[PDB]
Design a protein around this ligand. Sequence first.
Ligand SMILES: O=c1[nH]c(NCc2ccc3c(c2)OC(F)(F)O3)nc2c(F)nn(CCO)c12
Ligand SMILES: [Mg+2]
Ligand SMILES: [Mg+2]
Ligand SMILES: [Zn+2]
Ligand SMILES: [Zn+2]
Ligand SMILES: [Zn+2]
Ligand SMILES: [Zn+2]
Length: 1213
Amino acid sequence: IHIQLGRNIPATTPMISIVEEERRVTLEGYVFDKEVRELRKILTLKITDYTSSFIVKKFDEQVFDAISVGSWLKVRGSIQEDTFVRDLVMNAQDIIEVKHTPRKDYAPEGEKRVELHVHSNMSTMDATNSISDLVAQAGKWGHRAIAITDHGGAQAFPEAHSAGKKAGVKILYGVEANVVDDGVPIAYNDAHEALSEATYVVFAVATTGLSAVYDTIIELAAVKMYKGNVIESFDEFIDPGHPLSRTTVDLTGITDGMVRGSKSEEEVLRMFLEFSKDTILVAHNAAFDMGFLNTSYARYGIPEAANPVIDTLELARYLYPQFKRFGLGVLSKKFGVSLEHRAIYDAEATGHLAWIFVKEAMDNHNMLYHDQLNEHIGEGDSYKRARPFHVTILAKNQAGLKDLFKLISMSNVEYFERVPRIPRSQLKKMRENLLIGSACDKGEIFEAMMQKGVEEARNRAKFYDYIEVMPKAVYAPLIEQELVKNEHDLEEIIQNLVEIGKSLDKIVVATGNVHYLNEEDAIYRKILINSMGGANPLNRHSLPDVHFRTTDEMLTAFHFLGEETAKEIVVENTNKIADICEEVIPVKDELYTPKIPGSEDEISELSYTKAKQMYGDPLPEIIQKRLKKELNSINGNGFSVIYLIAQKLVHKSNEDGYLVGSRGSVGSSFVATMTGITEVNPLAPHYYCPECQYSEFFEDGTYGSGFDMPEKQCPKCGARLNKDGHDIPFETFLGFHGDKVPDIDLNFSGDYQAEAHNYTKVLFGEDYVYRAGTIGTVADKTAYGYVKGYERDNNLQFRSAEVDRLAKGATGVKRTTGQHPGGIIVIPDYMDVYDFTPIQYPADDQNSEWKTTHFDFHSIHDNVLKLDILGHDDPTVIRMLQDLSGIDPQTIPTDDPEVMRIFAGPEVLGVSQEQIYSKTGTLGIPEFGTRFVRGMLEETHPTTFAELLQISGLSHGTDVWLGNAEELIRRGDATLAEVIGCRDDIMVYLIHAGLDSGMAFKIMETVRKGQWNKIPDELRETYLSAMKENNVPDWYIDSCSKIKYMFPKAHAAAYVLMALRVAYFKVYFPILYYCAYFSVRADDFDLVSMCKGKDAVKQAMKEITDKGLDASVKEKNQLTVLELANEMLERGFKFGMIDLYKSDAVNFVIEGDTLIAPFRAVPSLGTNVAKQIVEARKDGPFLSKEDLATRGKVSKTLIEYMNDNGVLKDLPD
DNA sequence: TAGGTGCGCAT
DNA sequence: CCATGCGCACCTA
Ligand SMILES: O=c1[nH]c(NCc2ccc3c(c2)OC(F)(F)O3)nc2c(F)nn(CCO)c12
Ligand SMILES: [Mg+2]
Ligand SMILES: [Mg+2]
Ligand SMILES: [Zn+2]
Ligand SMILES: [Zn+2]
Ligand SMILES: [Zn+2]
Ligand SMILES: [Zn+2]
């Protein structure tokens, strides 16, 4: 429905202009953000006119909900400064929608262009629009196809595929690669002269620019050198007709008078031709000087003078690869040569070097002749010193896409130097199936035509498949940089490129170099670019207009070539290129899991062997049914390899002595329990006898867990009965019908995570396992910082709403690549990684031990296995506790009543709430020591394992406790054990009632996804009818209505089991528990208040607490560690200052009832130097107090900290 | 260079 | 008024 709020506005100032707190002002813009709050519902709209952004405030509620982002609104209200927000705000008594016509492509339906150069926000910090919206715009405009060519990557390929599907637009998959010429010769006119005895005319030119085509030399210098000594010198001035531009007068120390009277070039050129006879020409960047000289020669029909040449730049690059910059000044400085830039100086400088370079070439290598100077070219790190140029690579078919993935992977893994580089030889080998285009003004064809001439461009263009010409608006930065003098030269360059292409019979296309969608989005790019400072060369000049142009805009931009040629290169040739490519699929459709022979049989055998050992050869019918259904779902769907890999990883972890916990719903699987993957038993509560295999199950819902069951002795024999089972259906893990892909996230120890990764490498091979890769983008904090820095540098004053709009526009742009925390991606050995994704190094770190996938794992994890082998501190803490006490972690009673007391109060510990500042003794207990969870425990007083699982679900779920169950419990409507804590509980409760398995599963899925309201009326109706028909209370359905997100029961069971295992040691072995906690979990210690005693710890805690809610993350971590230290002190244990001999590098030591702090506790004692003092103390004592700093590498400062705190006092020096 | 600190991302 | 944890960017002694 039409959205209107107040009086009909008469059917508007630029928001930028309005600054007074005036009233009765019209203002219409675009709504880029919406937010309704509940008081009188208050409306806060951020609206923009692309000039500035203001905030419309309104106090109708149906309209409030109806207004949406992307709308156009006119308010005509009163600007009132007063607000919660300091900025001026608009109080709009009426807001009215307005219809804005979008950009349209006015060309005929069949005569639409294809945009072949598109940059998405996956071009790192270069483009700002998602490929999805660009593809949608192309679809709306009627374009038959569009290309996604990002700068060196293909990370937008999956999103581009989805968008092209949705929009009915063909996607051409390409990349803007940086290609480096594999072989750049050192010697040009190959000849068999002897370098040691030859005569060299080391020459140089001072020019009015860099374009040999469009400018000319003004000074010609040269020195004839022999045996390294000068023989003759030829210096001359050439006068251009035009006065020297101030740029030249400064770059080159030459003024118009300085060359006001000089010989004509024809004469100077003849003089140099005679002077440079039977000699080996020499130059720094000899291509540049030789091109200038040869163009000048040809200007007067003089012979090209093709004597042997040497380019000192290439020779220096080949001889001294260790160097980083090879310009003349840098090289002259390194080799101690002197230079002011006048041609004479340049020449003498090059000569003084060239002698050294030729001597090195003759001695250090076998290059005694001119020809031999080219033998070893393009071999080794040559790619690293070369200057890359832009090329466009498009996949023509699926094999072309695999080749493109290989090229990207090699440019990321083998030829990376500050950018992904492709050597031209590699691009030549894979060219079939690939379309190569000249890219932009940074491509080599445009560079040659604007700086070297038509013949060099027609030779380079021989290698491309099509030639790209962009509108003059894209090239404007060249005219601003003096690279192209004026628009006439630009038009000439573009026309020559069109002709060169027709001459060589190549497709010439107009591309556009799109970097953002609309002309108003340019600002975003600017901000991003500005954020790079001097790192980005684009900051030197102004950015072009690289928005997405329609067909008519492109035809207008190329009208200077004539209507026929423009219509050809814009519409016909682009669509020809599009038609050349067949439909390509960058992402697979099915899941390709690895194949391990005998996996289904192995999983079944393991499960049944463990089940027999635990429940006797005749298995209980309950266990028989469970195992049969689980294994039929697993082995039936080909999911046994997932279970087998998890089993092997956990088995190897257990052999090394580490417990593996789980996250998610793996604990819902009884096959996961029997195979050993998970510790959670999802069976119904029950007893089983460790000795005689007797078992007894309670499927009546009388106990929440087998742990809550009372102690009992075996009827068959005298042994005690082990109680297990938590009533977790497997449908939560395998879904109803068991067709769901199992997902087993395992929390291995932090120490052991690398071992598990390497074990995956062993299981599947080094070439088929890759660390899952993530793409980190510009988020709100970074975008806000970018906008603030931009406004500071440009000295503007943005309104908070604009700033927020500019931050939004620049958000989501790719900023870096990293690794997923625990995700290893496994490729089936019958395929290769390039069937799925390119590869790279995380953050482009070539020293990385693992390679990550180029694509974000979200785009590929449906087609290959992503092993979540995560690291958690709990298995580390439990391993340390086992080390410190010998107790096996799995023998710890998780049903102990005394331990559960810690969840009621601090007394079991032996301390008060008054002393430990906490009602509960769960401080330092994982997932239960937080203030929120501690408050929930205080308000609920759990006393059973089922109630602890409830607490986990309620504390971690969304909308499950704050407004849904805190009240129900406080008012006695339901007990803690009755409210909805975990998603499995909904199904369990409904099944225990009259509801059926399917209905209960559907209800639980709808509630856990927060779709109770989102589902249609008919569905909600069926569910409500069934629940009420079966005596399901009203408060239970009300709860379901308010739940946004719920967590699995197996997840909570695993985390509660770990917490109980740690709490056992906290209660019965306090010193061991505190030692393990501080050694593993605590990283930032004051240690001074800690070493003092309880009073200093309490004072530090009070300081942090009085710092208030506005406290740093470091302060909050310090508060946590200080709370633990205070609790430990209250219980009679104490900390001790570090000791050089006693203290460990990273672990607290136990001595009596005292914890000796490690070196890493000392403020900044560092960790490497920490191990150092450990290494030194075994060589010998630390005598003189100076010896310590000397060997250990202890920084005086730290020595001071130890000096005052008593550590070094021992030292008798 | 090695910590320290944000900050983004993920389970 | 969710917990925990990893990894890279950037700054600084
Ligand atoms: O957002 C998440 N928060 C948490 N908090 C920690 C937590 C600990 C114990 C729990 C628990 C949550 O839940 C439980 F009730 F099951 O027992 N964990 C995850 C995760 F593994 N994946 N995701 C993302 C899926 O949304 C989350
Ligand atoms: Mg020079
Ligand atoms: Mg997973
Ligand atoms: Zn770019
Ligand atoms: Zn480019
Ligand atoms: Zn480009
Ligand atoms: Zn028995």
